[PDB]
Design a protein around this ligand. Sequence first.
Ligand code: BGI
Ligand code: BGI
Lengths: 790, 790
Amino acid sequence: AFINDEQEYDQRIQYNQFQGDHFDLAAISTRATGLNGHLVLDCPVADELLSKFPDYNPAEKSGGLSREFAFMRYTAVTCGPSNFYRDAYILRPVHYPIPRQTELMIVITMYNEDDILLGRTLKGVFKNIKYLESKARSSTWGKDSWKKIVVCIVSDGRTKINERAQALLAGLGVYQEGLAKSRVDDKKVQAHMFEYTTRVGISKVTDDVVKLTTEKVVPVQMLFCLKETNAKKINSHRWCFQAIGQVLDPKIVVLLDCGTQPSGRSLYELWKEFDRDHRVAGACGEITTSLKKRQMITNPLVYGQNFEYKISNILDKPTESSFGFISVLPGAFSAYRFIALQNDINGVGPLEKYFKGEFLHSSGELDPNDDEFQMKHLMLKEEAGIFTSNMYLAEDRILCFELVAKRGCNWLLRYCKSARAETDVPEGLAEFILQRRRWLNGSFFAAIYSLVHFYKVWTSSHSFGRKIFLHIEFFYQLINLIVSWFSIGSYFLVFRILTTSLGDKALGFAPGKILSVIFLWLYLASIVTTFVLSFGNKPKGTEKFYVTIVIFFAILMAYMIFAAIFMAVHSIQDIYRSGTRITVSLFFQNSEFRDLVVATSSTYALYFLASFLYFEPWHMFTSFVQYILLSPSYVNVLNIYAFCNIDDISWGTKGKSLGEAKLREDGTFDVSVPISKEQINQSYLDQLEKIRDPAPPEEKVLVTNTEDYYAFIRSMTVLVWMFTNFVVIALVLETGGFNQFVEATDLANLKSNRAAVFLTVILWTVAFMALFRFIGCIYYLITRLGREIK
Amino acid sequence: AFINDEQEYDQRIQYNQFQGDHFDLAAISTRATGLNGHLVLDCPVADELLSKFPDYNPAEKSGGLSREFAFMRYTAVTCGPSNFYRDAYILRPVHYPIPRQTELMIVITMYNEDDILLGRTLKGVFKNIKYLESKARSSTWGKDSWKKIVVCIVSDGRTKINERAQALLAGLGVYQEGLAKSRVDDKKVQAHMFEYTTRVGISKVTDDVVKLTTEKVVPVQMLFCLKETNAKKINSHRWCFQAIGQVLDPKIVVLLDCGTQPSGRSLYELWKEFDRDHRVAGACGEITTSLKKRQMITNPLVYGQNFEYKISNILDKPTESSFGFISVLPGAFSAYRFIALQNDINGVGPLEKYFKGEFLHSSGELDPNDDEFQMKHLMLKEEAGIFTSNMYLAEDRILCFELVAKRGCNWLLRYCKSARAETDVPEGLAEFILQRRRWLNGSFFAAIYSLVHFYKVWTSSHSFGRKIFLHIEFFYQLINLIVSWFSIGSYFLVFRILTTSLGDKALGFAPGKILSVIFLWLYLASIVTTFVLSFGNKPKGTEKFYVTIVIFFAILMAYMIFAAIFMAVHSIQDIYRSGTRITVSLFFQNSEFRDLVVATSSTYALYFLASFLYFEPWHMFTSFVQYILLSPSYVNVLNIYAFCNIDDISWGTKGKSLGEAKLREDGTFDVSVPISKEQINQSYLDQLEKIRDPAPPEEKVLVTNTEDYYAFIRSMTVLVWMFTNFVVIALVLETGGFNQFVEATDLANLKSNRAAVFLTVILWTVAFMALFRFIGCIYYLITRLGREIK
Ligand SMILES: C[C@@H]([C@H](N)C(=O)N[C@H](C(=O)O)[C@H]1O[C@@H](n2ccc(=O)[nH]c2=O)[C@H](O)[C@@H]1O)[C@H](O)c1ccc(O)cn1
Ligand SMILES: C[C@@H]([C@H](N)C(=O)N[C@H](C(=O)O)[C@H]1O[C@@H](n2ccc(=O)[nH]c2=O)[C@H](O)[C@@H]1O)[C@H](O)c1ccc(O)cn1
């Protein structure tokens, strides 16, 4: 088990002086004393772990180690997040005789994750902490910097945590099996907290095994909170913010997920981003996809996701950062300023909005024995509108808007490209669809909520120009939402127009008509099958149907590109045939050539320039084709599945022995039945009276269950989506009854004109959005360079 | 509580001699002795119930009543249906010193039904038994006929049974609360059986209250089997047939449902049907809908259902009875010959097929403690094909085909119109849809199964002509299935053709085009909304959407009828305009007039004649319009909901405390945690070894859950249905890409020709099916009259 930039860190660190502070222990005889009336145990760690440390001395009973390094502390929490601070639950960092002030709380969320992912995450965090320690000419960082950093691991589900990750945590010395207790004082234990200052560092993380060693390891404060029952990531975040954060009172809370490995200096970059400008309240870093042992042709999906991530980080994040409002901060890797998230005195704030979703989106069955029964009952009893009851879709995204548009605060959201983190993307198609469901739903709901409540930014204390530019960004987001809502209809219209154009006898392509008909039939079949499977079955079961649909859509996209190229070439040849010389004006006057070629080429050129200026050009070659071929799948399959499954009904449906006869030694059976005449007569009369009366009306008027409400909401949403898309399609191609209002000959010309107008509109809208994003990223680069010079 | 044809029965009955036979009791001290090692208690009934009887004498301790009338017997059954006969479970009728042979077992099924429905059913049964007793010149019936009849009530769910119905049963004296025991000898009690010979008769059943009296009441044997947990009607029928039937060994088992009130002589008619011809194995009686306090205009749905039932009983049942094979025997009211249902020595038979559906269609989670674990494990372990695993759809319908096409037996199914029963139809729309789901699914699956396995009738020992006529019936059923599969597409095609015909400028109707377009859009919207609601929501929640859709379809049907009439009138006027005189040949040569008018008029005339010849003409006037207006709803809404919900997933998903710390008198908490160095080191080494190895491949290869299988089956079925219907529609109206293969002018003429051909085909197919059924019912009437003369 035990065996270049990192080397620089080791040189600056002495490694000889790591004596811990003395703290009061809890007596353990096996009666044990608990601090403040709570179940607290300070057990000793395995002797071998102590022996590994260089400072260990065989003569010393404990090796001469400090109290913190020698004993691991276990606490059982029964109250829950809401009352954790109210109760006298004291964490070790604040329990020292000299209080320790936290500067950076690194939160890690785990759920049945393999030991490899946790090992990679912990290796990244340890490397970042080592770099922070090694820093010499820093006012805040340097010697004894590890005392200001706390690593919190919140595992979701005691019975769902992977055994190998638990073994890894035990190897760190944080976790011990025997300590955990199910109940205390007839009260259920909601969470189990283990606190330990580990001096064990992960040397390397291979593909199959994890190797940890004690050589050149900086001490790290570890707090491992194991939850008794899984209550989702929102409940995990409630534990992190509402309960632990208040006790620790840290700044710049960093959120991480298992499998995300930050760089060697990324956390320092995030902290510097927060430190330079005091108005910044949230930050995010570039996220990258690993391509170590994945081939270009064997894994098209991975490379498509890589291209998507690179384009996002290069165009979308910089522009939003320039405007000061980021739609989404990646939960996998982001950071928030703690004070900015605090609610107002009135009780309304970003955290309240974020947490309300967990309470509202759940079965209305509250256990009276829970100590949080009053809070949940009050929250559910309150009248909730459409937006409040549907906050669960937005998730973290709501926090960004709530932070920017505060009543009287001046906060901003910023994106830094210096911070980089590597994560693992889902290789399988079913996992990809399941992941994209929530992304799409959250993005749509967040956009709608922000656009509807855009007036809230007026009261915020921002500069007038800042408000004007925020309004410009809101207008851009409105345009993007409108374009995204009509994605499927626009794709179908473009496909139909391009395929039918090949059917014209003017151009010499014979199989055009038959191919167009076959592709239309296959498209309709794929759409219908996708809808049926989305409503009925689970992605993991019927994966092959989705694979076939994706392959068909890739082939169709290839055919569409070929048709567009053929049409453009034919138009150019006709231009030359017409004679009278050729001029650039004539080329730009031809609708076919212009729309089909110029717009797409301009968009590609903008993407290429943006990639080059960021010194990340490879993704424009290695992973472009896969993304282009998969785009129709992105629009159709993912969007259909996301909209059909808006409601996430995780909870199930709903939720005195008469007697016991025991055979005795003899054949007789011991029974207790009525014997007296009086009681039998009384029972008979009671039955007669019970039946001898008319049936009263029920008039239950029960509130009923919430699952019906969310199912209704999802049904209405999908119906409206279908109706609008079909209205647009009927208007463009005269598909419905509109063809009756025209004649045999006028229909063709009118349809052609409408199709041309639609094509030019959509293509130029896409090109203009690309230009907008390009200019935004250019400005981001210029301003970042100028700030760096300063 | 206690207060003309029936009068005739009382006159013939002496009512003075009703002494019961003596039987051995079980000692009840409160240790009580059980017969054959089972928990059996013979408790005394309430003294007032004994006092009511005329034979009661105040001087006598028990009033002089017989043992059976004085004591009620309770038995606790733990084994279940499979092993009930194997175990020494003895029912009172077979426990007498002189064994009693059962002649007619009247089974009643109850599930949270109101006391009113049970009261009506029991009143009907008691009246039938009284009539049988009164019969004088009968070899089998007459004096002491009540000893040959046993009434079995199987209630589904101990905790779901309605309290008022239970009070009614207690008033009868069958049920007592104290006796029931949850467990015996550490074995769960599956069912609770109460046996009593009640002399209490229901005098009348008002709308709100039930009145029972002891005057002029014939004793009735009652066996009330209350099941501990609900396992559906198939499990109830398993209890009735597999377990009670074997012990009683009756003939002509009669099946009834709560709320079905048979006539005063209906059961005698069924028994006579069985007695006259020994080849008959199953029988059914006419079922009627009550219209006492329901208005023609206030309740259109009730009258539509009334018309449907009358037409069914007048046309469908007689023809199938004439052929000797009935597709469905109403479970609410039918009868079966017990010996015909018995399985073969090899273990294959109608009952095995019927019961296999319950076992296969359920969660694959068998409790090892069940005594039927071996049987269920063997059945599930066996390889099951598509048909065997989907038998749950057919339900009772499978029994009919399994009976007719036996390997070497000669059995027939017959329908008698002398037997009549009145039932309550669902007034609400949601209840109607829920009821029709299973009807449609069962009919479709039974038709498919019978058609596929038509060759099984070859080996049956029937006359050659009988086999020929059965094959003719199979061909007719194949045609009916084909017509029913394409119902929605045919309806849409007819609607589109009729609405577009009004758009032609030849006829002077201006709003035709706009109305056609609007109706097309509304039709598409209704279809899409129906599909979405069927997949997503529950009928009870979103009832108003269905109501609106039904109203729209009724309006559309009215408009379609108007359009057809207008077109026919215009065609006749053009015929007159053409000149050259008029002849019947010219009228029958015009496709428009012929197809639109002659076929529909012929069908209506056939229906009218069939109604008149059966002396039931009123339904052709009172309830015809409602059925005509609701037919499109029948085809669209019910069929869509039934096909979208083929899978009935009733079951849910899926299905050691670390320690306990108790605070003592002092502040210390009592805990048990590791103390010794050795155990801590051993645990640390164990964790190191656990993590120090590579991850082995899972390779679970688990069988997985069955719900996915049924969801997949339903998805495939709906997809195939959609594909076939759309193919037909595209072929007829040139809706898809087919229009590309024609020109501007030829398309209109070709579409018109195809539409005319489709209209004539469909209308004449309907007319010919109506004629076939009419001839069949005519033959049924003639043969029944001839048999009556004989
Ligand atoms: C999605 C993320 C990462 N791949 C991931 O999987 N995140 C999970 C999530 O988003 O839910 C985390 O949630 C935990 N979880 C799961 C189930 C539960 O029930 N409770 C619970 O806490 C999981 O263990 C996991 O750590 C990915 O890197 C990413 C995100 C944003 C982005 O812009 C780019 N990339
Ligand atoms: C449907 C029938 C009657 N209205 C009815 O409701 N039958 C129920 C059924 O068909 O299921 C019976 O099944 C019992 N049941 C219910 C739920 C459960 O979970 N377990 C259980 O035993 C119910 O109590 C009830 O007696 C109607 O008259 C009819 C039938 C056929 C026909 O051609 C014409 N009309």
